[PDB]
Design a protein around this ligand. Sequence first.
Ligand code: NI
Length: 242
Amino acid sequence: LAKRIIAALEVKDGRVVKRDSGDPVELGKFYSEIGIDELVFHDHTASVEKRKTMLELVEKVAEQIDIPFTVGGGIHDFETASELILRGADKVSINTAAVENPSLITQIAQTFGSQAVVVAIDAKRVDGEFMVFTYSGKKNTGILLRDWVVEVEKRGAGEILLTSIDRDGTKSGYDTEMIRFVRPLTTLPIIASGGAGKMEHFLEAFLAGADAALAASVFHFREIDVRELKEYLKKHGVNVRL
Ligand code: NI
């Protein structure tokens, strides 16, 4: 029912990519304090140190933070997802590995529940169709967004993290056309991702049917105050946690 505001932290070798400004645990705690509802960590650590680095991150976050958090970035199998949830993550995000093996969604859900499984979907307009992209936007899968959304729910996912490659990195607004396209295809909670620049963008995403709105730099560089944002959304009829 209540719409969620979510902070994304991109991390590598235990540092926040761009007390300690770049300590993911400290920045995470700062966000829970100012009224962020959940965190998403996305790790780009080198294969050799990656497994250990992500387990150390989850351990250190789980004891210092009280709000729900998701971890992801290169989770390729059940064993990896399992060790991260058991070490303290509430949820894992899978994307490339989900597209390549949709049964991985069901495998994680069978042990940890559908609510522990976030499928991150990166989509872009190609020749007038919404297409699914894998490998951090490098590969057009040729799979229609319409088909993948329905399959992800069928396989037992709990939530969709929907990133518009067309808006990600810009401050031009969330892709409300893409959110409105996905909304009638699924009963799952949708996290809107990519394009947040100002408070009005959050209102537009919730009108489009997003259950949550994710951003990074607008919070990180304090272009948007989280308390001001929540006060703004409540003023215009959005059900937010205050
Ligand atoms: Ni990535």
